[PDB]
Structure formats: structure tokens, C-alpha cells
Amino acid sequence: RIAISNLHKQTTKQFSKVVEDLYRYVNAATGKPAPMISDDVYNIVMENKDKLNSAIVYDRDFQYSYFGFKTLERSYLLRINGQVAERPQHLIMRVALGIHGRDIEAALETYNLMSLKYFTHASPTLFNAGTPKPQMSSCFLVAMKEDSIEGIYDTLKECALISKTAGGIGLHIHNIRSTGSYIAGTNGTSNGLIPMIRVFNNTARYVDQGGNKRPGAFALYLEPWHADIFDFIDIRKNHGKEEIRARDLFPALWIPDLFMKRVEENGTWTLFSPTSAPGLSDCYGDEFEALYTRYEKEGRGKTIKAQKLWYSILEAQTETGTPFVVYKDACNRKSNQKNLGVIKSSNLCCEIVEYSAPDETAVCNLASVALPAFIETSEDGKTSTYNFKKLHEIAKVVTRNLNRVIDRNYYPVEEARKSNMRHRPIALGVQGLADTFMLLRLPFDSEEARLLNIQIFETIYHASMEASCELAQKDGPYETFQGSPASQGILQFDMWDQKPYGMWDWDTLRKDIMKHGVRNSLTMAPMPTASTSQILGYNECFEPVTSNMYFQVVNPYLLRDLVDLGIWDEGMKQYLITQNGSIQGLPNVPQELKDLYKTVWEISQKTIINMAADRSVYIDQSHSLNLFLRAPTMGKLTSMHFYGWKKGLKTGMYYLRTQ
Amino acid sequence: RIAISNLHKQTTKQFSKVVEDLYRYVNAATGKPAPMISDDVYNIVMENKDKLNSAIVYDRDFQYSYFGFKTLERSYLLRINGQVAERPQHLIMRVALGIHGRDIEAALETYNLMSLKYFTHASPTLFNAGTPKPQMSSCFLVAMKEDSIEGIYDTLKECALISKTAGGIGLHIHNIRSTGSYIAGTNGTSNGLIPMIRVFNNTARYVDQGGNKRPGAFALYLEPWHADIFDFIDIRKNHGKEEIRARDLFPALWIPDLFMKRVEENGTWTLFSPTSAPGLSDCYGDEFEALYTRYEKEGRGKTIKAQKLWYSILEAQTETGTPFVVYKDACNRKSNQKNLGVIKSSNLCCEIVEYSAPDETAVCNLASVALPAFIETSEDGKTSTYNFKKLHEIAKVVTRNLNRVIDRNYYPVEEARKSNMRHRPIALGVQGLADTFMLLRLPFDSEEARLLNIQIFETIYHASMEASCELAQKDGPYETFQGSPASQGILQFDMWDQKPYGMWDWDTLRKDIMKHGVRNSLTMAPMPTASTSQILGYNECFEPVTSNMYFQVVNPYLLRDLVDLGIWDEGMKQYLITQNGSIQGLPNVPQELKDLYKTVWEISQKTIINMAADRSVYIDQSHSLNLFLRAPTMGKLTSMHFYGWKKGLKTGMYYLRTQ
Ligand SMILES: Nc1ncnc2c1ncn2[C@@H]1O[C@@H](COP(=O)(O)OP(=O)(O)NP(=O)(O)O)[C@@H](O)[C@H]1O
Ligand SMILES: Nc1ncnc2c1ncn2[C@@H]1O[C@@H](COP(=O)(O)OP(=O)(O)NP(=O)(O)O)[C@@H](O)[C@H]1O
Ligand SMILES: Nc1ccn([C@@H]2O[C@H](COP(=O)(O)OP(=O)(O)O)[C@@H](O)[C@H]2O)c(=O)n1
Ligand SMILES: Nc1ccn([C@@H]2O[C@H](COP(=O)(O)OP(=O)(O)O)[C@@H](O)[C@H]2O)c(=O)n1
Ligand SMILES: [Mg+2]
């Protein structure tokens, strides 16, 4: 396209010369040298400039589309005086070196694979890899340090320092005393969560993310037994008094099984202040219900009808798409981190399931694989297959990549460095799942698509466990590996009490893990892929298309097919805008197409949850299950929560999107 | 009155039995023992119960008026289950022991004097003396730790921990980079003071003071050269966008002489970011003007017309009564703390002039003397005189009191304890100045009242320096006494280049100070006396009456006189409400009365400033000069600032009150 050509004109070609430009950069308005490459990476480039410059293939800048490329210019490529200095290949090459340091062999391998669009790293890595303050992490899981003004304000300092750089914040607050609680040393009473949430909201608005044009935003995690619960869930509502809302933060429920049983049973639910019911957040499952029932019998709390709370939550979600729902017990029963203690929250997108404490703030580095790039016709005729062997091969590269990032990362706070060097959690993901199904001509809700889902995820989990095992053989297991499920030979699907699909040799892998350990406590956590999917030009994530339309450019695979059937007139172009990206109830479109290009609003949510359930058994962590409802009703939303809850899911619902 | 009798009924009489009740107290709704007396004070009472209980004179509860007594019940006397448990004599006795510990001799002497209304301690002391967390201080002067997110958030933690208890905050911010400034490590630009002030505003609203029904509030200090100045002064304005205001905070200008010259000269004024003009706040006077003029010649800032800024400041004050005005150079040239470094702010009421730094947060303990209590007829006939000898005697008691508080104080933060144990500053003040003049039949603007003002303050400063000297002989001088003006024999009026009035022997005192030192770096800082003056039933401070009226109860001294002239009919009662507390232009009132009961709005502000000027030469620190304007104009307000500025005043203006 024109835009790519215009870049090639207004930019230097030689990579080493672009690295010089950037590294030598000086802020003209200030006189301060503002270098955009690190000493480490600069020196690496200059001692390998012939090898490097010649490896860059500039054709590959035409691998991107208009919406893809303009994302890169608008925010990703490095700038010298507002003007763009990096080419897409330069960004990628910088990222490759930034990850691999002196391993030029690996650097070239990452480069090739990235430039060919096999995979990509999360935005923080793209921004910061190769730069002086290389903060490459997306996820921070932060413990509320203690139920005190000192505790709260230390915690608040930590969130600001973290927000100063890339990456969002999951913050759990189950230990802050609710409204009206006693405070020793004064006749004053506690004001509870809301005024304190307003303070975190304010810090959110003040500290811009990486200096970006972002929404800076935290997700907050609370257990539905907390006496401040009704207000907490209403935090994003559009009306009411401004003093009781916090519109830049996201409420998330950390829900124990007992809450759900009691709702299903139409029973009673009791609410506590954590000062009156200590320990509730530091246990789960059976131990939680022993302790909760006891406090409930001891008059320590306020009982109401479970369904009163339930109904209130369903209101908040229908209006605002929040609170998110994550099942505390499913998260804890099935974490490879359970040997560390009780997991108390997830992250900003409900995918990370990691342990966190006042002195240990969980971190995660993210990368995603492009599923469509492993499709080939490779048979004979024209029937396309999916190359699972290249997928396995590539997911071992991404695992080794993300494992290097841990060591080369700048950590905003000491709690993060302590946490990551100990457990070394890692987070692989996917994009282009819908595209894959479409290219292989499989309706999202087919028995074939169902089988492909499982196979894809079985191979990614196996690959990652294998690479991580090979890494353990080189560097030793991670510090806390002794006593872990993995050390006892218990993998993820085992914690779901299921045999794996069996496309790979799990016996040999398990044997080796028990012998040598693994480098990473966790490996898999499919994330929302918001901006990175636009860069590669794929559908987000593992969801299906939201519409076939989306200055409005129609689905490429649908368009191809409408032209092939020679029915693409103006009648199609208008009925598509009219029905906003739906092709059902169109008189002249074949049934195979209507089944293939069903929009997410037309696929059943039981099918969506089934596939989440199915693939979930190969997920160390969790995944961001977005839910979509056409004509929403209380009962309709109720049976989705309970359905996924019974399916054993960790993340029951990320966002709820409507009409 | 009825109210005092009703207390004596619903309360135990024996002091030791009230201390038992309080100390043994248990929070019924919680089960936690919530003792309201300390171990220290409880044990003292029980080992002296006969001596103590018999010393209390319960007649003295009738020393208070209706508005006085109801202040005590509403917030001062200790409560057992919402019900009042303390009598006024019990509060006083608790305070006496809380200050003096085991010195029962001193305790009894303080008690008697306090119960007789010779003097009182500031509200924090009344609340907390004798209690487990005895935070007795009113004033905190806090340095902005550094121009960083870490700096800002440490500073913010400190203000919250301080606000958790009694006492207000003076916070200086001259070192935070202004809007649009460069930040290393990001393409992001600085947002400046306002968004950061919104964060401090929020913390102000969240942390209630002592758990009170207060306005929690900080005063912020800035130098008029700061590039963020125009917005800063408008922080309390009633209109505009909510995002640019901070209605719970008070802006205060720290003004260098050069700003005023340039305004008087109709010259230019240049504005800087502290990152572009480092050091401006860490110097004053001649050194400031050498450094400022240089940066101004070096193009580092933005020049505009001084009077543009001046006019903007006068708008803000006319509408909102703020910004306060304190003259930086007068404060620094004339501080006994100049050997410590450069003073960077005052406090919440513009009276404290103390040194503060990131590791040293200035604190001050306050007490005030009741001026009317030293009036006696003691001559022969009926002509009243003022007993200066009892005043001297009493001001030595208050100095010794406030000196004990320093050692028995609970400090909210380590920076405060370091600061106070080093310099031991102290702050005496006065109330009932207007009452004194009235009782002695002296118009506020008389040559007699002028002479009384000077004499009163000469004796308080002398007394305090004397007591502090006697204390130094017992315990040694304060740590930092070597190199101080006082160590070189230079007292306050010397720094104003003036001979003292000479009612006391300054030669002998100076001799002794140079020989033995003093215990306190500073002693005198007349404060606004808002609530304490209501308790004792006197006019605030050293200002004159705001009206003769104030369910509306007329001035006692005026009423007395209107009845004595037998002219007090209903015509008087209505013309007083009609003219709201003014007696001028009333046909049947003698001229001596009209001159005596002039309202503050009728006394000339040149006279007010003259008396501030006069007395100021005996003030270690500064005083809260409230200004009052009838029909305000730009020029009218201009000549007040310049008049007081030329008079050498430190605090040019606290609040500005209008029509
Ligand atoms: N001044 C205040 N304003 C508002 N909330 C407060 C205040 N002081 C305490 N709180 C609330 O109670 C706090 C816990 O008290 P904290 O300051 O940690 O210890 P404390 O004052 O020693 N009382 P306690 O924790 O009961 O021994 C936080 O959870 C706040 O929600
Ligand atoms: N993420 C951010 N959001 C808003 N303001 C910021 C941010 N980062 C820095 N600032 C502003 O600049 C800060 C000073 O930068 P700071 O965080 O102390 O050190 P730094 O990031 O290392 N850059 P520098 O101080 O220029 O070396 C504070 O004064 C803020 O006003
Ligand atoms: N709008 C967003 C989205 C995600 N994030 C954080 O960045 C992580 C990356 O998730 P993602 O799927 O959106 O990936 P990218 O936005 O990095 O391409 C999320 O898990 C959040 O922790 C954010 O800070 N702001
Ligand atoms: N409304 C007020 C007034 C003063 N203060 C602080 O308490 C100090 C006492 O000053 P003051 O003259 O008002 O005395 P009292 O209010 O303690 O009787 C002031 O200098 C401020 O530091 C406050 O916190 N809130
Ligand atoms: Mg506490």
C-alpha cells in the first residue's frame, strides 16, 4: 500500500544506521541526551552490523494491512522529533536482540519467525525491548499490604510506580475493613471500601501509562462475602452520586463455590468485615466452608438472601458489563502454584492465575501465536490440513523467548523482581482462532471445530512443557518447584481428572519433568490480544467474529466467497451494513456460508463455554472468556454463570457485551 | 446555667473514679478493651488520688458561658457510649497530669491556673493529653521529598499518617516540575502541579482528622516564579472545570522581595520550571536575586508583566480570600533557625516559621494566654491597671508546659520526632486582646492601645526567653543552638534593628542566653485561637470584634454600658441587628462608646498593620494577620500588601474577608 512506501522514503534503510540515529538522540528542546537504545543492545549491533543488516528482508513490511500498519506508526515504532524513524523490520530486529542479547543465532530465528507473522510478543515487549528501561511485562498482581493507612498508602505507591510503565494491575482488597468498622485509638468509625477506592481511582488518572494516551486502569478483586459488596459491584454505573462511583477501575468478584450453591439452593448468604471474620481469604474449598459456616453460626456477620446479592450482580453486569467473574476454588484447586499458598486474585483481563502477597507481586510476560500461519494444503489435491508439527516447533521458540525476557526485564518494584525470579511464570496465548476455522471451512460450532480446538491447545501446552523442561536441564528448575503438582507428576488435565486427547506423548514428558523439573511454574494463559491481533491482521483471541463488517471494510474470507459465487452486487454491500455484519436471513447466500460466517451473537453461549471448558484442561492459568448476549434476561445470564461454573471453569466471565 | 448542672447530675464527681471508668472502658459492640487513659497517667492518679480529688474545685465549672460550655460537651470532654463522662475540671486535671507526669507540684499549678482561665492549651493537647496515643501538636511543616513519583507518594503517605491525628499541614511544593516539562525515559510530558494537587486533595477528603467531623485540610506553599502559578492561585474558585480546582486545600504564596519590587516598578516577571531553574527555593534575598536575574538573562524561562500576575492574585483573593501571603525573605532574614538552612514554607494558619526538609518535618505545640485575666483595679480608686508582673509569671508557666509536651508527645511520623527533639520549637500566643482594650476603655486605634500592645508582647517574649534559659541551665541548650542568632546575642527586635521598649531588663537576659543557651529555638507565634477562645469566652486572637452582635447574643461590655446610660430599649436591640453589630450612626450613643466599640470593618487597616508591625519585633515566628475590607478595590488591596511588605512583616495576609 501507499502508506508502507511513504515510510520507506522518510526513513533510513540500513538497520545499524537507524540504531545509531536512535542511540545518539538528544532532546533538542532540553539539551539532555535521550538515548532510545541501551548500551547492551547498541554494542551488540555494532559488533555484528554486517550479519544483522543483511538478514533484514524489507519485502515483509507488505505483510501488513492498512489498519495493521497504521497501528505500528501511531504508537509502536520509535520516533525522532515526532517523525517516525523505525521501519517495521527494524522494530522486530530490535525486539529480537532485546530478548536474546548475545545469542545472535536465536535472535535471527526469532526475527525470521516474527517478520513472517508466525507469532508476536505483547505490546510492552514491542515498546520496550532493546531500550534503556526495558519493562516488558503486561501483568501485575498486587496484594493489599495491610488493613492500615500505612498499608493502603504503601500499596498506593506501588500501583503508581507500576502504572508509570507498561502493563495493567490486578489488585485484591479482601482484607480492608468495611463501612462502620471499629478503629482503635479513635471514636471515629471506618468509611469502608468506596472512599478508599476513590483514592486508587485518582492515582489511576494521575499516573499516565508509559506516558501514553491510555486509560490507565486497575482491576480490583473482592469476595462476595465482604460487607461492602453492593456498592463495590456498582462502581461503574452511569448514574448515582459521583462520590460512590469509580469509573476508571474495574470490579472483579473472586467467588467461592459456596456462594453459588447457596444461590442455586435459594439459601442465605452472610456478610462480614474482615476484622470480624479473619482468615476467609486465606483458605478455600472445604476449609473455607468449615470456617465460613462457623462464623455464620457465631453471629459475627449480617445475613441476607443469597439471591438478593445475585440479582444485584446481574444488574451491574447488564448495565456495565462488569463485575468480572472468576471462581476462586477452581483457580486454587487447579494451580501449579498451590504449594506457595492461597491465590487471592486474577489480573486486569482475568487470565493470569498467580500467587501474590505483600512482599511478592506477581508478574507475567506475554506472547501469542498466530494460528492461521500453520494452515497448509500439504496433501496432494486442495483439501487443506493444519500442520501441528510446526505449531509444536514454534511454541517451543515462544517459551524460550519468554523465558529470556524474565532475566532481561526491568522491574518497576522490588516485590515484582522477588516474585518473578522465584516462580518464573510465563504466559503463551493465541490469536486468529476464528480465521483458522474459516480458512479450513469449519463452522465455529461444528464437531470438527471442537476437535481442532482441543488439538491446537494440546500441542501448545505440550510444546511449552517440553521447552521448559529442556530449559530446566540447562539452568535448574525454578526455586519453588519442590512440592508442586508438577513435581508430583500431576499436570493440568490431571487436575481436571481427564485423560489428554493423546496426540502427543505425555508419558515421556511427565517422566522427564519429575526427573529434571521445569523452568516455569506456569506457561499458558490465553489473553485478549486487543492491539497485537490488529497488527498481524487477525481476529482477536479465540472468540469468533463480532460482525462480518467492522471506513468499514468487509470480512476478507466472506468477500472472497461472495465473489466466487458471483453474487457480490450492491445488494450485498447494503444488506451487510443494514444487518451490521450478519449474513443470515439473506435470500441468495448458500447455507454453508451462513453456517461458516455466523457472528458471535448467533453462536450459542453453551457452545462457547463448551469450547472454553474443553481447551481449559491444557491451561496452566486461565482465559479471558468474553460473553455476548443478544436479548439479555436475568435467567438467561443466570444459566450461563452456573453452566460455566459447573463446567469447572476458572474465569466464568470477563466482559459481558449486549444487544 | 442549666447545662452545667445537668452535667454534674449525669456524671460521677470523684476524679479518681472517673479515671477508673475511662481507663477500664470496653467497646461493647466489639469486645475490645478501648482504654481512654494511658498506663502512665492511670498509675499516677491512683498513687495520688487523695491529693488530686481534693484539689479539684467544682465551682469553676461556672466560669464558662453557654456557647463556651457547649463547645466542651460537643467535642472536648471524653465520652463513654456517646454519653459524657468528663466534667470540665476532670478534662483540665487530665491535661495537667498528661503534661507534667510525676511533677504533681507543677500539675497542681497548671490545673489551678487553667481552671481559673489564665491560659489554655491548643485543641490537640485538650483532646489527647493523658490518653494512650497522645498527639498534642497542631502544626506540621512538610517538605515535598523529591520531584519524582516515589517522592510524591512518600510525601502523600506522610500527610495521610499526619492527618490521621490532630493538627494541620503546611506543605511546600516549589520543586515539582511544571506543566509540559521533560521526563526522562518516556515521550510523555509532565502534567504539572494541578493534577498532583488533586491527589493531595483526595487524600485530604479520605483521611478524617482524629476521626472528627472536620474539614481535613492542608495549606500548600509556592513561589510566584513557578510556571504553574496562575492555576495554583485559582485553586479555590467557585466556577470553572472541576478538574482544575481543589476546594479542600489552601494555596499560599511564598513571596520573595524581588516579586514586589518588580510589581512596584511595573517591570517584568519570569516564570520557570524548577528543573530549568534549580536552586531558587534554596536561597533568599541577595543570593536569590543574583541567581534569578542570571536565569532570566539566560532565556531559561517565560517572561510576562509582573502586574499581570499581581492582578490575577488580587482576583483570587477578592473572590476566595486566598492565596495567603507570606514574605519569604522577611521570614528567613529574621528567623533564629537560619543556621539550619533556608526556610521554605509556613503552616496552615501562616503563623509558624520553621525549617523543614525531606528528613525533618517541623512540628509545633501551641498554648495561648488570656489577656483579660491580668486586669485589676489595684491602685486605690477605680481606675483599672494591667498587671504585667502576673503576665510575666504566667508566660513562664506556659513555656515550661509546652517544653514538657515535646518530650511526652506521640509523633505520627519519624521526620517529626527527629525535627522536634533537635530544635524544640515552641509557640505561645494570646486571646482576648480586644476584650482587654474594651475593659480598660481603650479604642483599638488609640495611642494608649498602641502602647499596651507593645508592652504586652514585650513581656511575653521576655518571660518565655527567661523560662527557656532557666530550662537550658537544667537540661542543656537544644542541639542546634551553636551558630544561632541567639547564640551570638542577637534577639528578635535586633533583627528588626530596633531597641526594645525597655520595660524589662534585656541586658541581663542576653548575657545569660549567651552563657547557658536556651532550650527552645523559637517561642512565640500568635495563632488564630478559633475554638479555644470560644471555650474561655473571649474574642479571637488579637483582632478586634467583627461585630457587636454575633441565637444572637450582644457584646457583654457594650450591653453593660447601654444599660448604665439607661438607653437600652427595643430601639437598640433592632438597630443592632439592622446594622449587624455596628453602633456608629446611632443617634443616642455617646462618642466614647462609638470609638470604643468600633467594629473591625470600621478600624483602618493601616492601624491594624501598624500594630502587627509594632508587636512583630517580639515574635520569633510570625502571626496570622487576618485582613478585613469593607468596599474592596484592586488599588485598595494593593496598598495593604505593599504597606505591610514595607513594614517588614513576615505574614502579609492570612485570610481576606470582604463586605
Ligand atoms: N483517619 C482515618 N480516616 C479514615 N479511615 C481511617 C482512619 N484511620 C483508620 N481508618 C480505617 O481503618 C484503618 C485501619 O486502621 P490503621 O490506621 O491501620 O490502624 P489504627 O489506627 O492503629 N486502628 P486499628 O487498626 O483498629 O488498630 C484503615 O483500614 C481505614 O479504612
Ligand atoms: N507516568 C507519569 N504520569 C504523570 N506524571 C509523571 C509520570 N512520570 C513522571 N511524571 C512527572 O515527572 C515526575 C518526575 O519523574 P520521576 O518519576 O521522578 O523520574 P523519571 O521517571 O526517572 N524521569 P526524570 O525525573 O526526568 O529522570 C513527577 O514530577 C511527575 O510530575
Ligand atoms: N487496554 C489494555 C488492555 C490490556 N492491558 C494489559 O496488558 C495485557 C495484555 O493483554 P492484551 O491481550 O490486551 O495484549 P496487548 O494489548 O499487549 O496486545 C493485559 O492482560 C493487561 O494486563 C492494558 O494495560 N490495557
Ligand atoms: N480549623 C482548623 C484550625 C486550625 N487547625 C490547626 O490547628 C492549629 C491551631 O490554631 P487555632 O488558633 O485554630 O487553635 P485551636 O483550633 O487548636 O483552638 C492551627 O495553626 C492549624 O495548624 C486545624 O487543623 N483546623
Ligand atoms: Mg492499625
Ligand SMILES: [Mg+2]
Ligand atoms: Mg526521576
